[PDB]
Amino acid sequence: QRRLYDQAKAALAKGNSAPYMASRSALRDYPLEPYLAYDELTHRLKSASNEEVERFLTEHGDLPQIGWLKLRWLRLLADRGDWKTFVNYYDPKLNFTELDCLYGQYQLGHGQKAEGYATSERLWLVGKSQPAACDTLFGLWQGEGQLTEEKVWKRLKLAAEARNYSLASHLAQRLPTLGNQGALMVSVAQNPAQLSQTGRFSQRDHATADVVGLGLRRLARQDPEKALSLLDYYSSALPFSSDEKVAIAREIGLSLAKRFDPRALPLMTQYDPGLRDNTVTEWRTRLLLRLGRWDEAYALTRKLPQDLAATSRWRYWQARSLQLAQPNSKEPIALYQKLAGERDFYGFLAADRLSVPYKLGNRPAHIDPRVLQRVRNAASTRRAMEFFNRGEVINARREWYHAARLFDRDELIAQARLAYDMQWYFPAIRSISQAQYWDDLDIRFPMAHRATLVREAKNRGLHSSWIFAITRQQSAFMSDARSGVGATGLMQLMPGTAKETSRKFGIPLASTQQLIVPDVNIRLGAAYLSQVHSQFNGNRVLASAAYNAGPGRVRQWLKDTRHLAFDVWIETIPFDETRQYVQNVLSYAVIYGQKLNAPQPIVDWHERYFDDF
């Protein structure tokens, strides 16, 4: 009929299961019933039989939350010493370190000594604190003389790299001979500038080298110039392995290169001449492009390994570096023509360099309805469908992601289309993306919140395509999206920025929790957008970057320039996030330009060259 399941759900959270038992067989057919079964079993888990739990795991092993039952149940199996059953259900792919440490204890108590050692070492060499279950394991492992001073030293080094200094220190008080260098590693990790006192760190042993090597790699982040100076000294003074040296040169080189210091080039060249490190290789090339050294850039683009060379990034820059080095050569038009077909930032630049139309080619997928029917009738779908109609966004979203976890390519696309048809845009975007079917531009770039975006764009003299592109990159139309560091909503406003932006523009805000309202979020998003637009003279390349990284960052990336090309500037952005972000926004603006029937070239005329001059 139509289900008052909330009676039973209210009974179970908290206390009593009597309504669920009464109701149960009316809900034989209802899809969310097994969430009730789940809690009913979970509250009495400590006294449920094996055969009952095992049976629940077979019948409902498709539930998003089934892993938590396995964790709670396997704790009991270990306490009770019922290892036969523990091992039948312990799954490493749950990623529960409590369980992995429990499985280590099994290994050691049941003959598998080599494997238990290896398990213990694998969980010991971690720079953060581990569960209590692992203390028991590390106790046992130690009691078979495997916990050597070398390994407590190695974990100490990981902990200092993780900046977990209370852990790092506990470990330093456990070094029977190296306790000096342990204390010295923690000092240096906290302030690596102390390495200027070279007399204090010249004790010629491997432990001292470990402290100096860490110190130099950390110092390289904020003072790469000082660290470059000190490298020369310390490499003579101390027994660095060849790999320990290249690891230091890597950080010093990368940090110098991101400040556009040409002293990075000889260092990078000497410590990675094989072009083994992709990141060193890309920034070596980027630094050359910044300095106008086109020939060297070009030579370098020709040496790249297969996996870099195959990218659109370095196909482009091979072509453009040649065009810059040899303006009169025609080898670059061949290279651009092969690339101009790709629907991607670099492919658009290639098409822009040839003055030829961009290639979009919207081509939605041939789907078998026998596949569509199967995915529409899957238990996980039926449940997710029902959570959507109930208002529970997060539960429906949880069900959706988790079913997709094991769907093949055909099924994922079927899933994608089902979500599009509901106007449920972010999950369609998400599913089609993990399907890697990129040609369906209707699903990938839908016109969601069009009224509200097109309105607040005209409001502030901004192009519709550009606001469409920002919110697509920032949220992908998840109205309640939240980032790792607390940026909130469709245009990922930062609580601190939202506060400023509210105050300035006379747009009222109740709270950070109100950033989830589309109409609120877009007003003060599009406000802050026009501000940074105006701060950089209508330059969407600069203005975009500012939106993601702060105008003071963008100002720093503009000193001291003179007639810098826009593509070289974008390519040489120090932050990987902000570089990718800018590239995506500019690309998405092209595409939403076509879909809004207000064409947008990859860059405007006035954006092509800029400087702080």
Automatic annotation (TrEMBL):
Transmembrane segments: none annotated. One of its GO terms (molecular function) is hydrolase activity, hydrolyzing O-glycosyl compounds. Residues 375-441 form the Lytic transglycosylase superhelical linker domain. The keyword Mitochondrion does not apply. Residues 456-568 form the Transglycosylase SLT domain. Keywords: Signal. One of its GO terms (cellular component) is periplasmic space. CDD domains: Slt70-like (cd13401). PANTHER family: SOLUBLE LYTIC MUREIN TRANSGLYCOSYLASE (PTHR37423:SF5), SOLUBLE LYTIC MUREIN TRANSGLYCOSYLASE-RELATED (PTHR37423). Belongs to the transglycosylase Slt family. This is Transglycosylase SLT domain-containing protein.
